[PDB]
Design a binder for these strands. Structure first.
Ligand SMILES: [Zn+2]
Lengths: 608, 130, 86
DNA sequence: TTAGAGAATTGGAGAGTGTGTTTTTTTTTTTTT
DNA sequence: CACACACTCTCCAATTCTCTAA
């Protein structure tokens, strides 16, 4: 259509002459300053912005967007032809390929794509609004598109051959093979004139040292679930990523990818069979992912412990005891997890705590124990049967690895998952067979469990294992067992209904006449308070002993010697150290031990 | 003729590398003549390999360590030639089933599996794993 | 295509004997009592010259062919010329 | 006695022909629940 | 379908046989 010879000179003029002001109105050539770095090998990736190109040629922007890959190659050629103009220093060779190219140049004094160590990408123009995956239709083939989606699978970084370098055994000459296709034919026999005319029979040996490789990474993007149409399955697209765009995104990341939408090339028998139809991939060009003084003066208030506990659940009344316990769940004990179990009737604000703590926790998950049809508590295998490669998905316990996992209806957990919870609570890992071969996954996470009675409402006449129908081997792993009771209570019910009705009619929390700390401030505080690693003084050992034995003997004297053990003392110490972390003091003290004892006693009081 | 050899596209002389490793074997003594004790242990035990610490190679000669890491496919056979030459210059009538293999190693990992790149191809690495 | 031959006129007097005159100008023989290594050096140099001349053959096949070529006009005329001056 | 010019036989380059390919669910049955 | 392997046949020319002169 256009004359690409003239277009290359236009691109050169843009790259040489464009300027932008960054500071105090001073003029800088943002692309010349980067061509200097590219020439000096200080920078490898050059992201040219078509919003910048639009400031002096919208027609060039339209041409690039409508035939992007051609213009990507043209921009790369123009940049390579421009770098000698900007050379002013010698390169420090740090890649072995730099050393090889240095000796290649010296021997030539005594392969453009090979000498090309840089990579150029189009940063998309803002006029191109971002599409969903479902909107990337056949009309956009070969055109620059911006696509939003969920990253759901990412491969390891692999070496993609760009220019294969061979050496001949007979004539001692190097041979070069640029590689555009996803597959290529290796060279066997030397094509040099010296070997051919003499019929020398000299063959070629690939030199990975001399060849050019580029980082390569496949991924899968998936539609946003709320953006999928009503009756439909979410669509997915393969994104092929190269060079500096690799390792930007991980699974679960919300991303926007500017790239070129292309059909997949086929070889052998696939082109025979598929006919005119073709699969597609997106060639990634840019991937984008979607206190100390001032609040210390607030933290100086003696309210701060109860202020945090109030901020842990402002929609619930009377349960400040439980909110303090859940604060220690988020803080954790000294190295260390703190596990909590909540029991109550169905349809109570016991799932509210799971939701709130999951929302507040930096790393977290919130599943249910009732046998999920997806990835369960433990990992699972996906076949990806467009190609057949098995791949491993984490699940709740693994995805909440260095944080907290909330499990609703913890009682309905099957034995296959209860054993996994035993594995997590005993040694903080899970194990799974991928293809008969077993791999091990980290799960170093605190469990917030919520159970319901097996049948009917809770009944204090019966024992706890009779109520919940879950064995003591599970129940004893937890540090606090709470009964989240619910009785009809006229004024509290009226206030709850007023609160929920305000939430419905205004889509916002009502004014409670209290100012809780904001969620980001709470997160920064917990990080600041868990950065500490307190130690218990040895003089307090006698007091810890006295508290433990008197609690034990009260259980003997007044409640028929209900179960306790040495892990009770260990749980008290972990709770007191969590309180020390919360108070940001590196020594545990009498008040910490007293509050840990009080917390355990009131949890048992809620049970009784 | 060995003195004419250089590693391909490398400018490192194989004979000079061999001599540097030989004087390393002859003169490194301080892990607290070190490796001649290992040669004697090979001589009496009959196991054809020599373990060598890359940190010892580095502290003795930084350039030799750089050559070993960058070009192991040529440098490690050069070290095999060096160690076998020393071993059979000594112990002249000891019989071995095979020539000795030099087995350089780093005491700890230099890289991890996630950070392995195409820049590391045909390069000596140490990684930890299960 | 031009399939090559080890014949009397392509290369034997062009890249062959004229270069073989020069091959041993820088040789490093050491004489009596060292005939074994002197012969090893000689064989290596002769083999290298033969390889660069006609790389298709092995060294003894090359020798058995060139001994036959010793009967040809060009070869013996060049031999006498090399004996005399240049 | 050597070797070189003309005729016939053998080596192999290459032109032409033919072949092969790209975990999942519902249901039964015995034993064990 | 169509792009690589696998196999056969043919022609071309390079080597060796035969007869002659230096
Ligand atoms: Zn060659």
């Amino acid at each position: 259509l256009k004359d690409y010879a003239l277009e290359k000179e236009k691109v050169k003029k843009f790259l040489q002459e464009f300027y932008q002001d960054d500071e105090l109105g001073k003029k800088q050539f943002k692309y010349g300053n980067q061509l200097v770095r590219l020439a000096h090998r200080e920078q490898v990736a050059l992201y040219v912005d078509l919003d910048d190109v639009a400031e002096d040629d919208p027609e060039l922007v339209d041409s690039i967007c409508e035939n992007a890959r051609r213009y990507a190659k043209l921009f790369a050629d123009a940049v390579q032809e421009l770098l000698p103009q900007y050379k002013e220093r010698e390169v420090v060779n740090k890649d072995v390929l730099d050393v090889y190219i240095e000796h290649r140049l010296m021997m030539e004094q005594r392969p453009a794509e090979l000498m090309r160590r840089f990579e150029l990408y189009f940063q998309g123009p803002s006029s191109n609004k971002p599409r969903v995956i479902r909107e990337v239709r056949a009309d956009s083939v070969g055109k620059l598109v911006t696509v939003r989606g969920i990253v759901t699978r990412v491969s390891e970084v692999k070496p993609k051959m760009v220019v294969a370098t061979y050496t001949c055994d007979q004539c001692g000459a190097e041979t070069y093979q640029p590689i555009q296709s996803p597959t290529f034919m290796p060279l066997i026999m030397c094509p040099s004139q010296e070997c051919q005319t003499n019929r020398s029979g000299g063959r070629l040996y690939l030199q990975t040292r001399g060849s050019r490789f580029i980082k390569f990474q496949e991924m899968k993007m998936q539609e946003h679930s709320d953006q999928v149409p009503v009756g439909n399955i979410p669509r997915s697209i393969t994104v092929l990523v190269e060079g500096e765009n690799t390792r930007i995104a991980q699974p679960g990341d919300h991303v926007s990818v500017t790239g070129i939408f292309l059909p997949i090339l086929r070889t052998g028998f696939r082109q025979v069979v598929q006919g005119l139809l073709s699969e597609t991939y997106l060639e990634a060009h840019r991937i984008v992912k979607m206190l100390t003084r001032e609040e210390l003066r607030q933290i100086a208030e003696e309210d701060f412990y109860e202020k945090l506990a109030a901020s842990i659940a402002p929609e619930i009344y009377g349960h400040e005891d439980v909110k303090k316990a859940l604060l220690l769940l988020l803080v954790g004990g000294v190295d260390g997890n703190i596990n909590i179990c909540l029991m109550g009737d169905p349809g109570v604000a016991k799932s509210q705590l799971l939701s709130y703590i999951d929302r507040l926790a930096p790393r977290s998950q919130y599943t249910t124990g009732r046998g999920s049809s997806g990835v369960g508590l433990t990992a699972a295998v996906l076949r990806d049967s467009v190609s057949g490669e098995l791949t491993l998905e984490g699940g709740a316990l693994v995805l909440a690895d260095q944080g907290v996992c909330c499990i609703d209806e913890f009682d309905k957990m099957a034995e296959a998952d209860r054993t996994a919870i035993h594995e997590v609570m005993e040694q903080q890992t899970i194990s799974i067979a991928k293809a008969g071969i077993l791999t091990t996954l980290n799960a170093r996470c605190s469990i917030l469990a919520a159970a319901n009675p097996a049948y009917g409402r809770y009944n204090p006449r019966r024992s706890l294992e009779q109520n919940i129908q879950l064995p003591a081997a599970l129940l004893s792993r937890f540090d606090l067992l709470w009964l989240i009771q619910d009785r009809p209570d006229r004024d509290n019910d009226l206030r709850l209904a007023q609160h929920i009705t305000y939430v419905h009619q205004h889509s916002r929390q009502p004014p409670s006449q209290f100012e809780p700390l904001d969620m980001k401030l709470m997160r920064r505080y917990i990080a600041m308070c868990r950065e500490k690693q307190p130690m218990v003084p040895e003089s307090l050992a006698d007091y810890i002993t006295a508290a433990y034995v008197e609690m034990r003997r009260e259980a003997w004297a007044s409640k028929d010697a209900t179960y306790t053990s040495a892990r009770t003392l260990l749980a008290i110490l972990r709770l007191s150290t969590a309180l020390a972390r919360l108070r940001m003091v590196d020594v545990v003290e009498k008040e910490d031990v007293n509050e840990a004892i009080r917390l355990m006693e009131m949890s048992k009081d809620s049970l009784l | 003729l060995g003195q004419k050899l250089v590693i391909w596209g490398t400018d490192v002389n194989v004979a000079a590398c061999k001599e540097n490793f030989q004087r390393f074997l002859q003169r490194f003594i301080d892990p607290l003549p070190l490796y001649m004790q290992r040669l004697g242990e090979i001589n009496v035990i009959g196991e054809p390999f020599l373990n060598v610490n890359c940190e010892h190679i580095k502290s003795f000669d930084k350039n030799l360590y750089r050559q070993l890491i960058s070009y192991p496919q040529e440098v490690i056979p050069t070290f095999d030639m060096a160690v076998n030459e020393i071993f059979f210059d000594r112990y002249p009538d000891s019989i071995l089933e095979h020539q000795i293999q030099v087995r350089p190693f780093n005491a700890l990992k230099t890289k991890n599996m996630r950070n392995l790149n195409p820049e590391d191809i045909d390069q000596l690495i140490t990684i930890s794993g299960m | 295509r031009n399939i090559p031959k080890l014949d009397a006129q392509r290369l034997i007097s062009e890249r062959g004997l004229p270069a073989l005159r020069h091959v041993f100008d820088k040789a490093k023989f050491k004489g009596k009592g060292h005939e074994a290594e002197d012969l090893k050096m000689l064989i290596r140099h002769m083999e290298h010259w033969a390889h660069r001349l006609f790389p298709k053959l092995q060294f003894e096949d090359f020798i058995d062919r060139v001994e036959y070529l010793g009967s040809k006009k060009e070869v013996q005329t060049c031999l006498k010329r090399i004996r005399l001056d240049l």
